[PDB]
Design a protein around this ligand. Structure first.
Ligand SMILES: Nc1ncnc2c1ncn2[C@@H]1O[C@H](COP(=O)(O)O)[C@@H](O)[C@H]1O
Ligand SMILES: Nc1ncnc2c1ncn2[C@@H]1O[C@H](COP(=O)(O)O)[C@@H](O)[C@H]1O
Ligand SMILES: [Mg+2]
Ligand SMILES: [Mg+2]
Lengths: 323, 78, 321, 76, 72, 72
């Protein structure tokens, strides 16, 4: 009669995360630690942080009442995913509790549907390493439009460390963007529902070498990138006939991107949802919830099914929790 | 060539099994290896027999495996 | 550290059983409670809750990590009650569930509590009569009964001469006083036996007027000799060094006598489990479920449907090498 | 010819699902039926829509399902 | 709460009456509502638990079967 | 505790001496660092695995640097 409690482990990127949620929407514990600067070093960070986060998690909830252990199985970096996986089944063998392999990208979507009014949304995944448009169509979560080359989150980081800005350059670019107030000539690259930021980036830093003011470039880089994002979202929204639009990922913290997308949504008579700040970026809570979502609806996997999947495709899952 | 043999002893035989079983699936999750490795369990200790081409190749696999084992042990305790 | 504790549920045929064993050989709890298949199922539905309640008094329900149940082979309606009860606990206690083969559970509980390592097992039950050995990476049936089982044959004969339903023991007692065999058909074909032909002639001798005690002696002589024969032949086919006697009829002293004599003659060992572990019990199901799961087998609920005709080689042995 | 509707309400919604899922796999484990059966879960109650040929066919199916459901409840 | 509603249709309205009267009168002792509507016999049963419901259903379905078996 | 033994073969025994002397003299857990013929033996004993990994990384780094000078 008591609700089942799951322990989630997030360790695909730079962020190490541990989460604890129940069968219901309640999140008992959630904490994530970042890494301030390399895949080998990032993996070492997970190996150091994960044991520490678990101590704090086991102080909130006693280890015996943990019924399920979920972990981000992928997609992500090789060495990073291995630490997460190893820690996940280490706990599974110790506590003598089941283990569940969880897709990272869907965990972002499902934690939004739990913390937002989204029922069947078209999700725009905008991360430091991801840029995809995911919707649930034909009994599977599918990517209708996604990025060629790199992600926009990666594009903002790579531009930041080029102009001598702190590593999480995303937020810092947004601040500088307000003071700019002059559009720079940049390439607008959209193909169908797919985008490319490689052409936009190289031209953006060339304009920096040209001597055009950095404030203007930050303003221009955002306007172009987010417009291209808004367009492919609009096309996919019409292609899937959904009634909602979700914005997940770390770049969801961008005020301008929210503004642009919410405006587009108000135009086509659809709703626009963004999760709480704690659940937008990488976190252990979303992995716990999706692991709980799959297992409660009847998915069991043995240890030999828990090997890492660095290139986990969205349509490789089997959605058993959607009515 | 460059060869190495690493042994990691554990307090109990049961603890040895838990770490070994957890790490084992990562030992089979390697499609492309920088050096040849034998990952076996003898009693309370985990044996790690590595034979590589050069010193840099040995360092990569030792770092990887000892990382996994470190992560496994650190979890069982506390 | 601490061992994993499993709760076993035995509900094949007439006997209801609940068992609790650890990762080690230690048995924490084991109790069994004593025809129409439809009525037998009702008996399980009433008995199982009482025994499980009783089991939770010895071991706290929170300390149960695994739930194993006899998935088959056996009677239809009986197997369904066991399975439903098994996964009801699995959903309640929020612990994994494992489907266990009945016939192999008899063997594995036999290798435990005895010095048997890789034996040729003679399964002699009320509904089963098989010779099972572990050969070529699977548990295989080398010889088995045509028609009915010998355990059933003694029951059908007992309730024919107006004896209580568990006829096995009562026939053995009467067999001692008889001491003269009546001419009965000795039916063995290859590695298989048939007791249907033996039975009809046994009851024919009863109508003829020969003493039931004398008939019981004769019925035992013929039936147990036929069983002993195919066991010896199977022993040569598998090249094993041990012989095991499991099932409810393993309680028979005469059968034990013939087989140990055969084993001492062919220079092989002979093992029989403790009286509590020979017949149907919840302990053997707990151990094999533990055996499979500890070696890394997880199954979801859709893999826990009943298997009334579960073949021995349909399992996948991940616990022996 | 012969129709029936059985409803079993439970104290909480959580208990209803638990009983339902345990029985469900036995509802799908039936190759040959004495009567057509609809076994669904609506909120805190378990619905049983049975349609049979004769009274004897309905009796067999009700006894079977109610045995499973009873056994499930008796465990909790 | 455990509830049940069983309906048994008959060839003629008279046949329904014969069976209805036969079962009602030859078996006098959970809450039960046993009525006859046209060509069909309705049986509304309300019990405390499943075992009690199973017991009363078994009883009535036995009686109804026995009643028909006499006619045929 | 946690122990390790690494052996590195070299083309010539003379080359082994050069590398061995290069690491030993330019760099001043329990460690045994000896030279046997054309091979360099490294017997390391540490408290925990993380401690062993740190010291192994150090020596393999130094040996790597020594060889890189010799080879072209
Ligand atoms: N306000 C923001 N504007 C633009 N990019 C951002 C902002 N906040 C975070 N990011 C980027 O989001 C990524 C982190 O996403 P994640 O790894 O999913 O948490 C990094 O590339 C950041 O630079
Ligand atoms: N001492 C005995 N001698 C012969 N048969 C027995 C004895 N005890 C039990 N049986 C038979 O074993 C069967 C029940 O045991 P089981 O097969 O474990 O359920 C029935 O066929 C009994 O007649
Ligand atoms: Mg992410
Ligand atoms: Mg048996």
């Amino acid at each position: 009669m008591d609700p089942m409690i799951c322990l989630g482990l997030e360790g695909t990127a730079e962020k190490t995360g541990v989460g604890i949620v129940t069968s219901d929407g309640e999140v008992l514990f959630n904490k994530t630690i970042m890494y301030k600067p390399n895949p080998r070093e990032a993996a070492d960070h997970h190996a150091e942080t994960f044991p520490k986060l678990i101590k704090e998690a086991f102080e909130v909830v006693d280890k015996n009442e943990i019924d399920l252990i979920a972990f981000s199985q992928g997609p992500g970096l090789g060495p990073s995913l291995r630490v997460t996986a190893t820690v996940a089944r280490t706990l599974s063998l110790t506590l003598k509790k089941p283990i569940i392999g969880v897709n990272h990208c869907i965990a972002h979507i499902e934690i939004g549907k739990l913390t937002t009014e989204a029922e069947d949304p078209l999700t725009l995944y905008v991360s430091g390493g991801n840029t995809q448009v995911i919707a649930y169509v034909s009994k599977k979560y599918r990517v209708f439009g996604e990025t060629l080359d790199i992600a926009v989150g990666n594009c903002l980081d790579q531009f930041a460390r080029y102009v001598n800005l702190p590593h999480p350059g995303g937020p810092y670019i947004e601040e500088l963007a307000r003071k700019g107030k002059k559009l720079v000539d940049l390439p607008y690259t959209v193909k169908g529902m797919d985008i490319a930021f490689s052409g936009l980036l190289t031209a953006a830093m060339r304009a920096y070498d040209a001597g055009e003011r950095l404030e203007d470039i930050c303003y221009s880089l955002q306007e172009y990138a987010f417009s291209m994002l808004t367009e492919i979202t609009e096309r996919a929204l019409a292609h899937t006939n959904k009634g909602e639009v979700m914005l997940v990922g770390g770049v969801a913290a961008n005020n301008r991107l929210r503004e642009m997308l919410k405006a587009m949504c108000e135009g086509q008579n659809v709703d626009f949802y963004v999760p709480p700040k704690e659940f937008c970026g990488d976190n252990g809570a979303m992995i716990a919830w999706l692991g709980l979502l799959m297992h409660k609806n009847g998915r069991w996997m043995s240890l030999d099914e828990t090997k890492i999947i660095p290139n986990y495709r969205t349509d490789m899952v089997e959605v058993n929790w959607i009515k | 060539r460059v060869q190495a043999k690493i042994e990691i002893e554990f307090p109990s035989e049961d603890v040895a099994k838990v770490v070994y079983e957890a790490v084992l699936y990562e030992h089979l999750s390697v499609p492309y290896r920088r050096s040849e490795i034998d990952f076996k369990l003898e009693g309370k200790k985990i044996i790690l027999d590595i034979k590589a081409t050069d010193s840099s190749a040995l360092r990569g696999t030792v770092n990887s495996y000892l990382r996994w084992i470190k992560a496994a042990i650190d979890v069982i305790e506390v």
